[PDB]
Amino acid sequence: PFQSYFSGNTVQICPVGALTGTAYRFRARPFDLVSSPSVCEHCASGCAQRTDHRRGKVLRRLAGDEPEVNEEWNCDKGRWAFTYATVGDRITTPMLRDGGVLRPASWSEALTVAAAGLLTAAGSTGVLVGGRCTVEDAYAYAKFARMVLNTNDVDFRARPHSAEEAEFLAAHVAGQTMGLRYAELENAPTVLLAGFEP
Amino acid sequence: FLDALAGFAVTLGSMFKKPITEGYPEKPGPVAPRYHGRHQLNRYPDGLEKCIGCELC
Numbered sequence: 001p002f003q004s005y006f007s008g009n010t011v012q013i014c015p016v017g018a019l020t021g022t023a024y025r026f027r028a029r030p031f032d033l034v035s036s037p038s039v040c041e042h043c044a045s046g047c048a049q050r051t052d053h054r055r056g057k058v059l060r061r062l063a064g065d066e067p068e069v070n071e072e073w074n075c076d077k078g079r080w081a082f083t084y085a086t087v088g089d090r091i092t093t094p095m096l097r098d099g100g101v102l103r104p105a106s107w108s109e110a111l112t113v114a115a116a117g118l119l120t121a122a123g124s125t126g127v128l129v130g131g132r133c134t135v136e137d138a139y140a141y142a143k144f145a146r147m148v149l150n151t152n153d154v155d156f157r158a159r160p161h162s163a164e165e166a167e168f169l170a171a172h173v174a175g176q177t178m179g180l181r182y183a184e185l186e187n188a189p190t191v192l193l194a195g196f197e198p
Numbered sequence: 199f200l201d202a203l204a205g206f207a208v209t210l211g212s213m214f215k216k217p218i219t220e221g222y223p224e225k226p227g228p229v230a231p232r233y234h235g236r237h238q239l240n241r242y243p244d245g246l247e248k249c250i251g252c253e254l255c
C-alpha cells in the first residue's frame with residue numbers, strides 16, 4: 001500500500017478527482033461545506049489548515065497555506081485524525097461521583113462540588129495540565145493553580161520527563177520565542193537530531 | 199348621458215352569465231402543464247432511482 005505518512009497530501013495535490021480521500025468520499029460538495037482556518041492540534045509543527053465541516057461534523061482538514069510553517073503540506077494525522085471528538089466517548093455534561101458511580105450533574109452542582117472539594121484541599125493540590133491545552137488554556141491552568149489553589153504543582157508533562165528537563169526548558173526555551181524557524185532549518189548547513197525523530 | 203351608468207349594465211349583464219369560478223376542491227381547475235408543483239424523484243424503467251446524489255439540485 002501507499003505507506004507515506006503524507007499520503008493525504010497527494011489527495012490535496014491532485015488537480016482532478018483521480019486521488020480522493022476514502023473518508024471524505026461522497027460526504028459533501030464545496031458549496032455546503034463550512035470552511036474555517038485552523039491549526040492542527042496534534043503535534044508541535046502547528047500546521048495551518050482548513051477545516052471543512054458539514055452539518056456540524058468535520059469532513060476533512062486540508063493543508064492550508066502557511067509558507068513560514070508548513071507551506072501546503074500535512075501529515076495524515078493532522079489531515080484525518082479529527083474524529084476523536086465524535087467517537088461516542090465524548091463527555092457531554094458535567095459528571096459527579098455519588099455512591100461510587102459517575103452520573104450526569106448540572107453545571108451549577110458540579111461547579112459547587114468541585115469548589116468545595118478544592119477549598120477543603122487547601123494548598124495540598126496538584127494540577128496535571130497535559131499537553132493538549134492551547135496556550136490560553138495552559139495559562140488558565142497555571143493561573144488557577146497559583147492564584148486559586150495557591151500551589152506551584154503545575155506540570156504539563158503527561159509523559160516521561162525529568163527535573164533536568166524542567167530546568168532546561170526554563171533556561172533555554174521559555175520566553176525565547178522564534179529563535180529558530182523553519183526557514184532556517186531549510187538553510188542550516190548541519191542539523192543534529194538528538195532524541196528526536198522528525 | 200347613459201354612459202355614466204354603463205357600469206350598471208356590466209354588473210347586471212354579468213348576473214345572467216354563468217359564473218366563471220373554478221370548482222376547487224370538488225372540481226379543481228386545470229393548472230398549466232409546465233406548472234412548478236411538487237418536486238419528484240424519478241426512477242428508471244427497471245426501478246432504479248435516477249438520483250445519483252450529485253447535489254447539483
Ligand code: SF4
Nearest residue numbers: 040042046047075078
Ligand atoms: S498536520 Fe501533521 S505534521 Fe502538521 S501539525 Fe498536524 S500532526 Fe503535526
Ligand code: SF4
Nearest residue numbers: 249250251252253255
Ligand atoms: S441534481 Fe443530483 S442529487 Fe439532485 S436530484 Fe438530480 S441527480 Fe439527484
